[PDB]
Amino acid sequence: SQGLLGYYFSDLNFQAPMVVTSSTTGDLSIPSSELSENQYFQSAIWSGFIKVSDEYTTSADNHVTMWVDDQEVINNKIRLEKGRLYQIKIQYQRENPTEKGLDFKLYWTDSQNKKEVISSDNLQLPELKQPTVPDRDNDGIPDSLEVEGYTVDVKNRTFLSPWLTKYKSSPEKWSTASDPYSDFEKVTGRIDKNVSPEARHPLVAAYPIVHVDMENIILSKNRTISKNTSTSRTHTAGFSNSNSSTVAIDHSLSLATWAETMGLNTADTARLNANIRYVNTGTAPIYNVLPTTSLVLGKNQTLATIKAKENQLSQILAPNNYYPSKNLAPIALNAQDFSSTPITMNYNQFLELEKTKQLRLDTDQVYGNIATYNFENGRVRVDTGSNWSEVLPQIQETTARIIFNGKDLNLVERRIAAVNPSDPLETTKPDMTLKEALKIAFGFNEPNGNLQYQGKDITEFDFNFDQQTSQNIKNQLAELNATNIYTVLDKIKLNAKMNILIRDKRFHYDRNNIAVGADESVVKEAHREVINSSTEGLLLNIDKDIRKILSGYIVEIEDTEGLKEVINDRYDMLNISSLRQDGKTFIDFKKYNDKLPLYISNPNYKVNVYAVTKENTIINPSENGDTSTNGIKKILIFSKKGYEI
Ligand SMILES: [Ca+2]
Ligand SMILES: [Ca+2]
């Protein structure tokens, strides 16, 4: 991944760089084919090192001053030894080249006086870590290019040129998002290949975000209860950077009371096992420390602490991915391990669990070491000297945060480099607009002068901010004499430490910003695409996001005077839908009608089907032990007479 590093300028004295690139060999040529009026380079500087056992003494020695260890070897047989790096610099100046590009080449000849063009094994890049071109942060991109904007073009080799994507970045910041990958590393691909594509932008932060997903649970007498669980990463807008997920435990029967199923009394004790995976929804991988997690009952009753053995991960935990991989078994809290700590609950705790059917997983931000690029060997490797713990707070202090749920209504967080007005040193950080932030961090695009996220217009999402950011953005709107944020997205300026929360408008949200319902019109409309209906059930085509907010359905026969009979008349029997492989929903009438189709004794009778949303879900008998669906808030989504079915 190596060779030297060249700057090619159109002016005579190195002030207006037009191409920045790296050659694998001593062939420092740029062919005009890889380039407009600006293709005549009047100067050029190359930097790097050379490696080797011998004495040794380019194509334009009358235009080239050169040094090997600030020791001019051109403008002379010098000695060099096996296993040592000699710093190299070459400068070049021709006024008025008649040709475009540069056919330039550097050679040495040995002691068997045999010449050669310097192999790709004797040339190394400068150490671009945190006769001179101005590069204050030593990332490799000249200050002028960072500020004015540049693009990168891939021929064969990356070519960096003044403004494909228009980049800008800070000439004062090795990594403009204060993360562990440099601006130059990101845009030339000298970076860990597991970093998310959008975090190869210098203004989008690369960092892990980890939470724990519980898939299922099993409670038992210390007679058992096994249930599936749904977990969501949460957010409560806030300014906290903690990781947390909430688990909802299936309250519906999976075989013909939790307290009645388990013979608990008072002095009894219950044990808990579960299956989990770690989930990385950030933009950078983790390699050798999984974070530690408290499993919490109620507000702050820690039932367990979940840990994985440091330095013995069986893999990467990559962005947009799971550990273990989904193709592998999940992690058991007490694995098939003598000395797994038992997870225990007293009677009171057990009833509290049954009351709420909820747990919380609080995960710390301890992510361990970083795989950084090494310029000495052009490889990416875990760097024991580099730790995420030192990086995360710098990222958090210099970026605006956008949390967005456009992807399956799951909360996804990105951080974007943005100016801090009070910081005297960030006169140099690129201005970041809200609109550009959504495009680069989340992939919004604008086909027809309308900002969209995968088919959904931006106005289908609501904008919410923390208190400081609200005041800031309100002030901006008035300054713009704008009334409406959607119309001035391109002019809203983002600052460091802003928090912005963007949520699909069709839904209702709990205080964790999980989608837990939708207004009745939304719900009814999502159920109008009926494919088939019969006395055995309904086949519908229902939007994925809609299904996510539904806990179940209630089926009901209504006679001609409107007397109603609820077929699945228990709060724990609403789980009669399933999602077929063609993506359609089947609502099964037989499942709790003793496996029989409905019996409609009169064709004029109605079959009504109601959806129940998450937030309206009853998860226990009432105070007096009522287990019926009486009282449950439900939404009519199908109603037809016997003779229409
Ligand atoms: Ca730079
Ligand atoms: Ca920079």
Swiss-Prot record:
Effect listed in the UniProt record for changing residue 305 to C: Loss of capability to undergo conformational changes that lead to pore formation and translocation
Outcome, altering residue 599 to A: No effect on toxicity
Gene3D superfamilies in UniProt: 2.60.40.810, 3.10.20.110, Protective antigen, heptamerisation domain, Toxin - Anthrax Protective Antigen,domain 1
Chain residues that bind Ca(2+) 1: 135, 137, 139, 141, 146
Region ranges (Disordered): 119-143
Effect in UniProt of substituting residue 465 to A: Decrease in toxicity due to defective oligomerization
Mutagenesis / variant outcome for changing residue 162 to A: Loss of ability to bind to LF and completely non-toxic
Record keywords, A-Z: Calcium, Cleavage on pair of basic residues, Host cell membrane, Host endosome, Host membrane, Membrane, Metal-binding, Plasmid, Secreted, Signal, Toxin, Transmembrane, Transmembrane beta strand, Virulence
Any one of the GO BP annotations: protein homooligomerization
Variant or mutagenesis effect after changing residue 590 to A: No effect on toxicity
Impact reported for residue 142 to A: Decrease in the ability to bind to LF and partially toxic at high concentrations
Region (Domain 4, binding to the receptor): 507-645
InterPro entries tied to this protein: Bacterial_exotoxin_B, Binary_toxB_3, PA14/GLEYA, PA14_dom, PA_Ca-bd, PA_dom_4, PA_heptamer_dom, PA_heptamer_dom_sf
SMART domains linked to this entry: PA14
Outcome reported for the amino acid change (mutating residue 394 to A): Loss of heptamerization capability
Site note Essential for binding to cell receptor, residues: 594
Residue sites binding Ca(2+) 2 per the record: 137, 139, 146, 170, 173, 183
UniProt region (Domain 2, membrane insertion and heptamerization), positions on chain: 207-398
Phenotypic consequence of residue 338 to C: Abolished ability for mediate LF and EF protein translocation
Domain comment (free text): The molecule is folded into four functional domains. Each domain is required for a particular step in the toxicity process. Domain 1 contains two calcium ions and the proteolytic activation site. Cleavage of the PA monomer releases the subdomain 1a, which is the N-terminal fragment of 20-kDa (PA-20). The subdomain 1b is part of the remaining 63-kDa fragment (PA-63) and contains the binding sites for LP and EF. Domain 2 is a beta-barrel core containing a large flexible loop that has been implicated in membrane insertion and pore formation.
Function noted in UniProt: Protective antigen constitutes one of the three proteins composing the anthrax toxin; it mediates attachment to host cells and translocation of edema factor (EF) and lethal factor (LF) into the host cytoplasm. PA associated with LF forms the lethal toxin (LeTx) and causes death when injected; PA associated with EF forms the edema toxin (EdTx) and produces edema. PA induces immunity to infection with anthrax.
Family membership: Belongs to the bacterial binary toxin family.
Name of protein: Protective antigen
Organism: Bacillus anthracis
